[PDB]
Design a protein around this nucleic acid. Structure first.
Ligand code: ZN
Length: 271
DNA sequence: CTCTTTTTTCTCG
DNA sequence: GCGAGAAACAAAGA
């Protein structure tokens, strides 16, 4: 998932599990708990979920007075709320059981991670990760963004994916944002003029807030949290190879940029 | 059968 | 420090 999908999950969890006491925690894949599964089980069993937050693509469960469970879903992680008698599915790894149901984490590729840290360690954790600002008008300052782009000779798509200029874009929304901003993904950032940077900055905020409003991009639904999104119906370029650009009618092309599949319009995003 | 495809963080040179 | 490539892992498609 990217930031809009994780935000969608965050909102659903906030609505459904806040206030629930964790009765037990079980793992069939305990090695994805990077701070130690048995330690987590001992610390969190019997505690109550107080809140769910998000920073960039990270989910943050607020548990008990002092605990923060930092969850990254990476490429394929999925949460679902299930009955206590629900059958095991193949790639289920962890479950938090409550009195009336359970929260199951599944991840086919086993890339996702859990880390248990304390409340006063959350801000240092994300400083160490060097996560950039949230993609909001209030936090994403165009002036610093502009100065960083001016200084660099990185290509814009890989630099955006780093999470350091702004948090939250992954391959789908970086491709969408660069099409909306009319910028080619291989453009060296120190070649961007001020008006392009301004359109890029606003397009990042607008696309991600649109995607959040639509419940993220689900391809497809899965019975999991966040699986009823509608943003996939709004994609202009990602996965649209060979289809016609809605802006000019050129075929959308796919290339590889720094190892990643990259979808763009060659007319609207001049090299 | 092989090769390719689909977030973060490493090695290598 | 950089970029290129790939590991972590599983599955599906050519
Ligand atoms: Zn076009």
């Amino acid at each position: 998932p990217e930031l809009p999908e994780v935000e969608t999950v965050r909102r659903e969890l906030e609505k459904r599990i806040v206030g629930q006491k964790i009765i037990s925690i079980e793992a069939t894949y305990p090695r994805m708990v990077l701070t130690g599964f048995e330690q987590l089980k001992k610390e969190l069993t019997g505690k109550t979920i107080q809140g769910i937050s998000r920073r960039g693509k990270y989910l943050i469960f607020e548990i008990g007075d002092d605990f923060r469970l930092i969850s990254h879903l990476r490429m394929e992680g999925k949460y679902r709320l299930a009955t206590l008698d629900a059958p095991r599915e193949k790639h289920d790894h962890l479950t938090m059981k409550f009195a009336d149901g359970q929260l199951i984490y599944a991840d086919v590729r086993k890339f996702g991670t859990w880390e248990l840290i304390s409340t006063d360690q959350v801000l240092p954790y994300f400083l160490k990760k060097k996560i950039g600002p949230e993609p909001t008008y209030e936090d994403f300052d165009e002036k610093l963004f502009r100065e960083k782009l001016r200084k660099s000779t990185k290509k814009i798509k890989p630099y955006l994916l780093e999470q350091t200029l702004v948090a939250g874009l992954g391959n789908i929304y970086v491709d969408e944002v660069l099409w909306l901003a009319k910028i080619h993904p291989e453009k060296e950032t120190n070649q961007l003029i001020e008006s392009s940077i301004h359109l890029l900055h606003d397009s990042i905020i607008e696309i991600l807030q649109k995607a959040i409003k639509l419940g993220g991009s689900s391809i497809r639904t899965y019975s999991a949290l966040g699986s009823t999104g509608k943003m996939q119906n709004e994609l202009q370029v990602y996965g649209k190879t060979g289809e016609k650009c809605s802006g000019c009618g050129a075929e959308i092309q796919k290339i590889k940029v720094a190892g990643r599949g990259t979808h763009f319009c060659p007319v609207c995003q001049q090299k």
